[PDB]
Design a binder for this molecule. Structure first.
Ligand SMILES: *[C@@H]1O[C@H](CO)[C@@H](O[C@@H]2O[C@H](CO)[C@@H](O[C@@H]3O[C@H](CO[C@H]4O[C@H](CO[C@H]5O[C@H](CO)[C@@H](O)[C@H](O)[C@@H]5O)[C@@H](O)[C@H](O[C@H]5O[C@H](CO)[C@@H](O)[C@H](O)[C@@H]5O)[C@@H]4O)[C@@H](O)[C@H](O[C@H]4O[C@H](CO)[C@@H](O)[C@H](O)[C@@H]4O[C@H]4O[C@H](CO)[C@@H](O)[C@H](O)[C@@H]4O[C@H]4O[C@H](CO)[C@@H](O)[C@H](O)[C@@H]4O)[C@@H]3O)[C@H](O)[C@H]2NC(C)=O)[C@H](O)[C@H]1NC(C)=O
Ligand SMILES: *[C@@H]1O[C@H](CO)[C@@H](O[C@@H]2O[C@H](CO)[C@@H](O[C@@H]3O[C@H](CO[C@H]4O[C@H](CO[C@H]5O[C@H](CO)[C@@H](O)[C@H](O)[C@@H]5O)[C@@H](O)[C@H](O[C@H]5O[C@H](CO)[C@@H](O)[C@H](O)[C@@H]5O)[C@@H]4O)[C@@H](O)[C@H](O[C@H]4O[C@H](CO)[C@@H](O)[C@H](O)[C@@H]4O[C@H]4O[C@H](CO)[C@@H](O)[C@H](O)[C@@H]4O[C@H]4O[C@H](CO)[C@@H](O)[C@H](O)[C@@H]4O)[C@@H]3O)[C@H](O)[C@H]2NC(C)=O)[C@H](O)[C@H]1NC(C)=O
Ligand SMILES: *[C@@H]1O[C@H](CO)[C@@H](O[C@@H]2O[C@H](CO)[C@@H](O[C@@H]3O[C@H](CO[C@H]4O[C@H](CO[C@H]5O[C@H](CO)[C@@H](O)[C@H](O)[C@@H]5O)[C@@H](O)[C@H](O[C@H]5O[C@H](CO)[C@@H](O)[C@H](O)[C@@H]5O)[C@@H]4O)[C@@H](O)[C@H](O[C@H]4O[C@H](CO)[C@@H](O)[C@H](O)[C@@H]4O[C@H]4O[C@H](CO)[C@@H](O)[C@H](O)[C@@H]4O[C@H]4O[C@H](CO)[C@@H](O)[C@H](O)[C@@H]4O)[C@@H]3O)[C@H](O)[C@H]2NC(C)=O)[C@H](O)[C@H]1NC(C)=O
Ligand SMILES: *[C@@H]1O[C@H](CO)[C@@H](O[C@@H]2O[C@H](CO)[C@@H](O)[C@H](O)[C@H]2NC(C)=O)[C@H](O)[C@H]1NC(C)=O
Ligand SMILES: *[C@@H]1O[C@H](CO)[C@@H](O[C@@H]2O[C@H](CO)[C@@H](O)[C@H](O)[C@H]2NC(C)=O)[C@H](O)[C@H]1NC(C)=O
Ligand SMILES: *[C@@H]1O[C@H](CO)[C@@H](O[C@@H]2O[C@H](CO)[C@@H](O)[C@H](O)[C@H]2NC(C)=O)[C@H](O)[C@H]1NC(C)=O
Ligand SMILES: *[C@@H]1O[C@H](CO)[C@@H](O)[C@H](O)[C@H]1NC(C)=O
Ligand SMILES: *[C@@H]1O[C@H](CO)[C@@H](O)[C@H](O)[C@H]1NC(C)=O
Lengths: 122, 108, 388, 388, 388, 122
């Protein structure tokens, strides 16, 4: 079945960067776009970023815009999030999620599958 | 940006309704509204998508609808195992996705 | 064959893409292309064709002088293959008259043409290329109809007709036809006050028509028809976004059961797709004249009096001339939903370009898609100086 | 397929409505449209087409000079889709000759063309697009035929032929054909004295033909043919309403077994529908020339020598040129009766408009209805100055 | 019907013979012939037709001024019967856009057209004459495709698309379609560095495409596609015989995994048939401009870096203008092998003949034979002075 | 079945008006035109007036022309006759009758159904 496995979590002193990634398996990576969602402890879910199936279209939540970069390497079935200039407000469990729609440029969800998440502390 | 009741409740066997109110650029903008169920310590599960479609593996006690700018999740036959934080989400005109504030569902 | 049944819903419309374009005026500069007006597009089970009313002359002929007139003995309803020009040699005449409508019911095509003098007009209803039935004028003042595709359900094809003043109240009726014969008729009901030139499309919920109010409103009447019950209601689109031409500037709040005032005794044929959040309205860009054309996604426009656009697309730039527009669909297409489509008449020559004595049009047609596709204006572009 | 059987009666005729119109002269001002004369309309089981004799040249070509002549090697019988012009590119040649007739028998079309010099003419009978049989001239003076649709019953198609002087007695015969071959022939009998250019229609009672008397009468001969027995009789229409052109003014009392005197050695092809009370006569409006055209409801015109019109309809105004007219029907149409139809040739150019050297025609065609519908003149309207 | 399966090998090619020729420019001097560019030939199960992109105007019309441009709203993909000119009256429009491709899969035809502005282009995929799916631009720099016949196997039709700079690296992709829908997609792999305008043919071994390298090479990229696995590889043709235009003079030794240097930022669409000893390469004769055309039998050209021609044939003399060329086949023909065929665009007018303001082309098409047949140049020959 | 019920009869001093009507049921009112016929005691039937199914065409017998008006209200399934300036010659039983023909503008009968009639005395 579909699995998404988050890694790269840890503690980042404020102002420093951190790079997260997800290993994807059980589906063709190249056919679906993907999303990052984060959840601060005790809070609800916050959408962070989306990337299209071929990496051509990248969109971000205003709260991370200009600080975070989303990318994907289709040859390694791996999704990445590059977070620069992290602040205390960015402490959260970060999750990868698989967009349900097949080879489309419509980045609308639903989030078909979720990974387990990894914690980033700032 | 999508407002949900902070919490809802009912006893086993009762139905409950969880609303999600956004604007015309969000919930009433596109029929891409979905609902997610999260138990503490776990990743969220997709329950409903495109306003009313249930993914395979989701029981038929979970259903939903939309009217105007308000989305609605109905949980029929409420069970004690249904206690969870439910979230609505939608695609917005900004080419972003948002989640609502979340609703805590408890069982009496 | 079997009659077409309206069983599917509409497909989500995220953007529009080019479906067809004939380049009739451009080609006609030096070829045997007919002068036409008031085009529409309609599909049979295996073919889509362009329809229009011909003036009985070619663009460069000398009988093109004076084609500005709307009603004459020379007018006929013709059709030709989609995206080809309305040539003399590839066109087929469906029927004769200065006003018309047509649709395929899943077994055979019905068409209606109206002819006669202004005070003694009549409609002849054809089916399967033979005359079947006729309707004579009742108000004795220009019997007229839809100028677009009609929609049939299980063999029943409602047709909207108007007879009466274009600058005041008129007698508006709906006739329900089956295999060219009349099964029922109704007087117009509901809250719309004046109806002309209805653009209709169907869905699993019934037949929806967007019409022109040439008497008072800048908003448009909507007729909602149930083809099984053969009953109907009417209202105006509530949205503050105005769609007629000429029109006053858009208000903050629209009207639902009354015409929105500002520009009397005028207007243009147009359309809308009303589907809750999946609602799109078409309109000109200019508010003073028939130029430009755009599509706006205006959620719940039919019922929300404060709704505003959240997305849109330019079809024709306001630098270029536009014209009448309307809706159509391929009701025999494969898939689980209907793909909405529309067309825009691009009028060249008189009454705006007085360097020539002819009036004619080109057709541009587009269909919806679920992808968010890039946009491009689709102008006519024939150079008027080449005709001088 | 099966042969068409004449089993239905005629539908009540309360009024006439437009069926078709090609606008051939108007379009031909600046397009590749052929010069034709002597049109007719005829239907196959699934299609109606216009038929005419072509001069082998286009309207604006230089070979159009001299098209006034009736008989030449260049003449051929062509057909094209109803309401389209007789273009070079969409026409089909059925056969070659200066005089012709044709009809579909329910399985395949028969056509007859006459060619040759005035004193050595012959008819070639085609069936299913192949030659089948021939008839040579017998009186050696212009073998000629109907110039209209023939009517078949159970495969038998009577055809009326004349050979002899047009200003005196002539040898008139009826040949009965089946699948292009001759089964029987008869010399003309009854009380008609001179017959040319018969316009025939069928009904469940047999085949009725209205003909021209180019020798003496202002009234018209009628041939009543029984296709089963393959026998016939003849007489004149009794009504005082005269229908030929030129004609003297209408008398109070007509004639039944003798031509009505006043205008010798002339006349025009025409038609009537004879059905007791449901009787209509067609004629020109002018009594001096071939202009205008009207339909008159003249009850019992065939047998009542004092009958006068009780209702009528103008087809062409007398300000406009008219021409030959005749009857046709769709014998394969759905319904419990036959819808009567007719056509009128609208002649332009020579011999009346001497500003041009060509003669040509346009076709206007109308069908009956049970409704009392409004009327409108249907003129040609090509402006002759555009051809100068 | 059933889907076409690539089960046969290629027939031995000993020589080429004339298959078709439209003489479009020559006929168009005084007839209603459309201005086209970028032709191709493609066959259905029972018919071969010529395809091209139309400019929406005739050769002698005034809108032919400026047809030198490649991308406009007026461009559309049309098709017409093989060896007839692209007339206004006999052409059918398949879809609208400035770049396209098409192929029949054994049940129904697929076609793709690309339209939109340079930075917001999109592809619309049609099947069985209806829109099915769309692809939006990904690199935002002229989405473009093959301009030739695509090849299907058991319903799957790989299509090559490029989006990106024509003078540098670009994003090249292959989409695998079935009944107009996308089943899979791949990024370009292998050792080719830049790919445009691929000419593809199939055989029992898979689908082979010869493409243009508009960035660096004088040799051509080859894409080898497996339609069952829906996978592919790429390389350059090893042969020292160079085939692009402009090109440097032929070396003694060629390259296989790298473009052969000498002429940057240019080139012409072309083709080859790669089959071991039965290998033929097409190319222009001039090395400086698109003139002449020849076929060379160059054994093992794909893999042998020192191979030279052992046989050849002149198609067009270098005195005459040439153009884009490409391959096609009749995959439904009787026999135990496929007969290889190809076409050459013959460009007239701008940019080489500045006496006229139009650019247009004629099509010459040839097929292989197992006989050693005589040769003859097949020039266009329209005299340019006749258009002045 | 079809029923037509006349009302509004009575006695009218000469020169005064009277308004008659018929209630129609058992058929669609809107699909048929209708006629009024009157019969003076001891006399035969006299046709009075006809109205088309949509009320657009109204014709009268010469004997009442200019004095009587015929109208119909399709929403109430009711036929009306407005008789002005009545004279002794107008004493008759007035009847409604249903035209047999379906949605046509041919006002020719036959009179398919008759009501029972109501007497007007002048
Ligand atoms: C490649 O192709 C793609 C294919 O899509 C191209 O993308 C398309 O680009 C076009 C560009 O025109 C866009 O069309 C316009 O869309 C806007 C709608 O979006 C705006 O509004 C959204 C709604 O939310 C806002 O309001 C709510 C209210 O509560 C509020 O809560 C919310 O916070 C927000 O305030 C916004 O979401 C949206 O945001 C997006 O865009 C922003 C742009 O800068 C960006 O910053 C954001 O991050 C985000 O990306 C955006 O704000 C339509 O409104 C617009 O239509 C108006 O303007 C055109 C301009 O000519 C005009 O013709 C229209 O008639 C109309 O303007 C008239 O009507 C208005 C009605 O209220 C009126 O207010 C105006 O004054 C004006 O009215 C006057 O004229 C009319 C007629 O002449 C007359 O009747 C009146 O009386 C009066 O005189 C366009 O539709 C496409 O949507 C966009 N498509 C997609 C899918 O994105 C892409 O650009 C191409 N790229 C290249 C390089 O070419
Ligand atoms: C909207 O559309 C509708 C669609 O129908 C239009 O309605 C149509 O309008 C046209 C108008 O032209 C009518 O056509 C004419 O019809 C009359 C027939 O009706 C008259 O006669 C009926 C017969 O009864 C009379 O005689 C009997 C005898 O015993 C007697 O008992 C009885 O009491 C009565 O006297 C009448 O019933 C009928 O009454 C109706 O009309 C009256 C009009 O004012 C009205 O008052 C009544 O209440 C009632 O409504 C009426 O009297 C045809 O006769 C006529 O044809 C003649 O006139 C045209 C005019 O151009 C001419 O071209 C014809 O050739 C013909 O005239 C020639 O032939 C005559 C033969 O006897 C001869 O006498 C004439 O002198 C003349 O002959 C001369 O010229 C010819 C050729 O050029 C030559 O050969 C001769 O030798 C000689 O030189 C028209 O057909 C339609 O019938 C009517 N249709 C319907 C269904 O109602 C409507 O008008 C349109 N509305 C608008 C606003 O446009
Ligand atoms: C009736 O119809 C029949 C139908 O077929 C006609 O028959 C045809 O006639 C044409 C005439 O053109 C022939 O086309 C040419 O064929 C030659 C190939 O054959 C030659 O080479 C064969 C290979 O063996 C040789 O090399 C090996 C190497 O190891 C060696 O071992 C071996 O011993 C031998 O040395 C020979 O077998 C063959 O022999 C035959 O012909 C001899 C002729 O005299 C005869 O004596 C023999 O007995 C035997 O019969 C022969 O030698 C192609 O090479 C040639 O193509 C070149 O020339 C044309 C001329 O315009 C040119 O356009 C081409 O582009 C090409 O030349 C360029 O490329 C070369 C590549 O190496 C290069 O070297 C050249 O310098 C030149 O390159 C320059 O220009 C290009 C482009 O402009 C540029 O890119 C470069 O950078 C550079 O600038 C032709 O294809 C047909 O083959 C022949 N068909 C048949 C079936 O026979 C018949 O003639 C008609 N009759 C009449 C009366 O009309
Ligand atoms: C088109 O038709 C109009 C008439 O409807 C022509 O205009 C007339 O031309 C004559 C020529 O001297 C003038 O005297 C008239 O005063 C003109 N009338 C009007 C209303 O202007 C016109 O010339 C025709 N055009 C062409 C190109 O033939
Ligand atoms: C049409 O043909 C006629 C001849 O049948 C041409 O008329 C002749 O033209 C010459 C030219 O000078 C005169 O000398 C003859 O006397 C004319 N004959 C007659 C009978 O008038 C006529 O010019 C041709 N018309 C056209 C438009 O070409
Ligand atoms: C074709 O179009 C070009 C313009 O794109 C025309 O060229 C112009 O003609 C005017 C006429 O005086 C000149 O003043 C301009 O300088 C010309 N422009 C160029 C770029 O040369 C051209 O004449 C048109 N050709 C034809 C045959 O109509
Ligand atoms: C259309 O729906 C009606 C609903 O009763 C059904 O009876 C009819 O057969 C359907 N028509 C076709 C052609 O299937
Ligand atoms: C036509 O009527 C005759 C009368 O005997 C009958 O025999 C014949 O079969 C009928 N023809 C057809 C085609 O039914």
């Amino acid at each position: 079945q579909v699995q998404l496995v988050e890694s790269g979590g840890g503690v980042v002193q404020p102002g420093r960067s951190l790079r997260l990634s997800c290993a994807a398996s059980g589906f063709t990576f190249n056919n679906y776009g993907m999303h990052w969602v984060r959840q601060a402890p005790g809070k609800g879910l916050e959408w962070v970023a989306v990337i299209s199936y071929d990496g051509s279209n990248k969109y971000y939540a205003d709260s991370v815009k200009g600080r975070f970069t989303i990318s994907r390497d289709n040859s390694k079935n791996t999704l990445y999030l590059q977070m620069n200039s992290l602040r205390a407000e960015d402490t959260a469990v970060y999750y990868c999620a698989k967009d349900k729609r097949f080879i489309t440029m419509i980045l609308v969800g639903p989030f078909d599958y979720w990974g387990q998440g990894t914690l980033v502390t700032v | 940006v999508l407002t949900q009741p902070a919490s809802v409740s009912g006893s086993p066997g009762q139905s409950i309704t969880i609303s999600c109110t956004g604007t015309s650029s969000d919930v009433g903008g596109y029929n891409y509204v979905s609902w997610h169920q999260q138990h503490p310590g776990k990743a969220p599960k997709l329950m409903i998508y495109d306003v009313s479609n249930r993914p395979s593996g989701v029981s038929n006690r979970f259903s939903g609808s939309k009217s105007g700018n308000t989305a609605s999740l109905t949980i029929s036959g409420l069970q004690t195992e249904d206690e969870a934080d439910y979230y609505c989400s939608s695609y917005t005109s900004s080419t972003t996705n948002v989640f609502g504030t979340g609703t805590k569902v408890t069982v009496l | 064959r079997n009659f077409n049944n309206l069983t599917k819903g509409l497909c989500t419309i995220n953007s529009w893409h080019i479906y067809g374009k004939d380049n009739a005026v451009r080609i006609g500069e030096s070829s045997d292309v007919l002068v036409t007006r008031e085009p529409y597009v309609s599909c049979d089970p295996d073919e889509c064709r362009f329809y229009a009313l011909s003036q009985g002359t070619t663009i460069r002929g000398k009988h093109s002088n004076g084609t500005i007139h709307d009603r004459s003995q020379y007018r006929a309803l013709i059709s030709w293959p989609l995206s080809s020009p309305p040539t003399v040699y590839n066109s087929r005449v469906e029927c004769i008259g200065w006003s018309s409508t047509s649709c395929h019911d899943g077994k055979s095509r019905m068409s209606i043409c109206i002819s006669g003098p202004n005070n003694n007009a009549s409609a002849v209803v054809w089916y399967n290329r033979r005359p079947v039935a006729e309707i004579n004028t009742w108000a004795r003042n220009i019997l007229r109809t839809q100028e677009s595709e009609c929609v049939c359900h299980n063999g029943v094809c409602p047709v909207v007709f108007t007879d009466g003043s274009a600058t005041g109240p008129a007698d508006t009726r709906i006739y329900y036809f089956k295999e060219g014969k009349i099964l029922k008729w109704e007087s117009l009901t509901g809250t719309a006050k004046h109806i002309e030139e209805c653009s209709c499309y169907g869905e699993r919920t019934g037949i929806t028509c967007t019409c022109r109010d040439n008497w008072q409103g800048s908003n448009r009447p909507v007729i909602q028809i149930d083809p099984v019950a053969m009953t109907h209601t009417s209202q105006y689109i509530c949205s503050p976004v105005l769609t007629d031409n000429p029109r006053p500037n858009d208000p903050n709040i629209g009207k639902c059961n009354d015409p929105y005032p500002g520009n009397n005794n005028n207007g243009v044929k147009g359309f809308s797709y009303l589907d809750g959040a999946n609602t799109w309205l078409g309109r000109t860009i200019s508010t003073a004249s028939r130029s430009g054309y755009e599509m706006l996604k205006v959620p719940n426009a039919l019922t929300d009096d404060r709704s505003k656009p959240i997305q849109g697309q330019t079809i024709v730039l306001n630098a270029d001339w536009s014209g009448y527009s309307g809706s159509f669909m391929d009701y025999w297409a494969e898939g689980d939903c209907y793909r909405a489509c529309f067309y825009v008449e691009l009028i060249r020559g008189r009454p705006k370009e007085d360097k020539v004595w002819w009036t004619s049009n080109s057709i541009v047609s587009m269909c919806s898609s679920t992808e968010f596709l890039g946009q491009w204006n689709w102008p006519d572009g024939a150079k008027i100086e080449y005709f001088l």
